[PDB]
């Protein structure tokens, strides 16, 4: 009698994965949910076994952050059931198994600073799944793109020691190695001394 959740979808942005569903609207206590998953390994090698999610074992909202769960670049199966005290609904399945390869990749955040002649950059902290390709150039007709890889986003990293001439420009994109994809570059932004 308790309806099993409908319209399951996954919302994946910068390698953070949100499992969503229509809430179950029923008179009783507060409706709680249980989400479980299985990676392609489990599907093929032990099809009848599901691993319970790391944060959605009986939680309120009609949503779930499965990020800590989808940790390999394979199709994952996700199911959710709703539960009102005694009554527990049927397991409802995601129509199309989710692969993180499809996460949406946002242009990285960027903060260019100057400690004197010293060009410095600190990128949005998108987490360990991410590396940044920073392109900086001395904005003159002859000069070329330099490229530096920056490993993480917490930190202020030294790009170059500018000379008094020209005005430097910088743009940035992400690289997620686990899925082999880049984001679009950030707006170019310039500076000088």
């Amino acid at each position: 009698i308790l309806p099993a959740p409908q319209q399951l979808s996954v919302l994946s942005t910068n390698m953070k994965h949100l499992l969503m569903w229509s809430p179950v609207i029923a008179p009783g206590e507060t409706v709680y949910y249980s989400v479980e998953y299985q990676g392609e390994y489990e599907s093929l090698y032990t099809s009848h076994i599901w691993i319970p999610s790391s944060w959605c074992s009986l939680t309120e909202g009609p949503e779930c952050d499965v990020t800590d769960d989808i940790t390999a670049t394979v199709p994952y199966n996700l199911r959710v059931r709703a539960t009102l005290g005694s009554q527990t609904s049927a397991w409802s399945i995601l129509k199309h198994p989710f692969n993180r390869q499809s996460t949406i990749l946002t242009r990285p955040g960027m903060e260019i600073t100057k400690d004197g002649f010293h060009l410095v950059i600190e990128l949005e902290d998108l987490g360990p799944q991410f590396e940044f390709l920073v392109a900086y150039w001395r904005r003159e007709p002859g000069a070329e793109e330099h490229v530096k890889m920056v490993r993480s986003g917490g930190i202020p990293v030294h790009l170059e020691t500018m000379e008094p001439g020209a005005a430097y420009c910088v743009k940035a994109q992400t690289f997620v190695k686990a899925i082999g994809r880049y984001s679009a570059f950030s707006q170019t932004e310039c500076v000088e001394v």
Partner: protein, 153 residues
């Protein structure tokens, strides 16, 4: 950075880092469950880097099949946290098995006797031990396996 693995004619890109990070979370717990301190399965006379490149891909494919066929799915623990990690390791291992299978399909995963010989040896060691002790021990030996793969320049 990914790890570029040189397996003779077979060259694949692997996310060694992801797997090592996942395994460091459980190494100590797991290795504590393994009483047979006198038996080493991945013995070191069978290291991958010491293998002729032609034969490496074959060896590795079998080793992965070993782990996927009879280790990951059979390790028993009451600890949910642990179980999740193990699913990570296995699915990560699966992406690699998938590339090796491609190498195989393209006829670049040749199984020569240096390869079969060293695998049989490993398989033997693993078969000496009583089942659960066996899986407990091999799971606890991921650090050797991941290093064998990092070793191969």
């Amino acid at each position: 950075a990914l790890k570029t693995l040189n397996l003779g004619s077979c060259v694949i890109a692997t996310n060694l880092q992801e797997i090592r990070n996942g395994f460091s979370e459980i190494r100590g717990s797991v290795q504590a469950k393994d009483g047979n301190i006198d038996i080493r399965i991945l013995r070191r006379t069978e290291s991958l880097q010491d293998t002729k490149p032609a034969n490496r891909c074959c060896l590795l494919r079998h080793l992965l099949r070993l782990y996927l066929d009879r280790v990951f799915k059979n390790y028993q623990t009451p600890d949910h946290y642990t179980l999740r990690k193990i699913s990570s390791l296995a699915n990560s291992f699966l992406t690699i098995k998938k590339d090796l299978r491609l190498c195989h399909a393209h006829m670049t995963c040749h199984c020569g006797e240096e390869a079969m010989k060293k695998y049989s040896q490993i398989l033997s060691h693993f078969e000496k031990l009583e089942p659960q002790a066996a899986v407990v021990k091999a799971l606890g030996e991921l650090d050797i396996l991941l290093q064998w793969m990092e070793e191969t320049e």
